[PDB]
Design a protein around this ligand. Sequence first.
Ligand SMILES: O=c1ccn([C@H]2C[C@H](O)[C@@H](COP(=O)(O)O)O2)c(=O)[nH]1
Ligand code: SF4
Length: 219
Amino acid sequence: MDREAFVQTLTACRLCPRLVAWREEVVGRKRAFRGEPYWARPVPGFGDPEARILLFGLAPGAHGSNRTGRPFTGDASGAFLYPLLHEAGLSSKPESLPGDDLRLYGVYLTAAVRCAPPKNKPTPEELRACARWTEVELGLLPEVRVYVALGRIALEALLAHFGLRKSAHPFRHGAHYPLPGGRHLLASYHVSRQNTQTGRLTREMFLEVLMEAKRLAGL
Ligand SMILES: O=c1ccn([C@H]2C[C@H](O)[C@@H](COP(=O)(O)O)O2)c(=O)[nH]1
Ligand code: SF4
């Protein structure tokens, strides 16, 4: 199927009972955004349809992409990620807001799970379920040369997708695994608030990951 079909069928998905309920249940839960329109549905990837770099997150934030409808947009993750994408020379502007004219240069953003999970922690069953969408979504991006896993779970999802052993591709910030055909898998700490607020993942550290992705992608 093409992108239009992918988005239409993905957004209708109701496979995970806990997530179908939660993505809607959280609407209005945060008073700060109560009254605001909520996507409250599976989140389609965002970016260059001819991307050479793919950033792979874990799952939507209840009041982030589950609210705005665009990956990482609306919460702490996007506040950290989007400005760095711009500094790395991979986007048109530092901020990401639904309905804006933001464009990514050869980069596409998505995640292993596409519906907001409680505690931002999907279950193995939910991860196994959404893998069907990872197959469809990555199938629409044949030009990708570098896959950047944001966190251990995202890395494991990519390893499963490519039939790679967890043992031989351990998770650590800065890990780099070459794949057949000049492709590359890069691992980074997730850009969640926990890692960024504590300093575990610094802005310079993430910019370094993006610069490496650019180099490896021939950008
Ligand atoms: O090179 C490209 C082309 C389109 N996109 C995405 C960005 C927007 O969501 C739409 C196009 O938005 P617009 O600014 O209206 O041309 O598709 C991108 O990220 N990079
Ligand atoms: S997480 Fe994925 S598989 Fe589960 S309901 Fe959402 S879109 Fe469907």
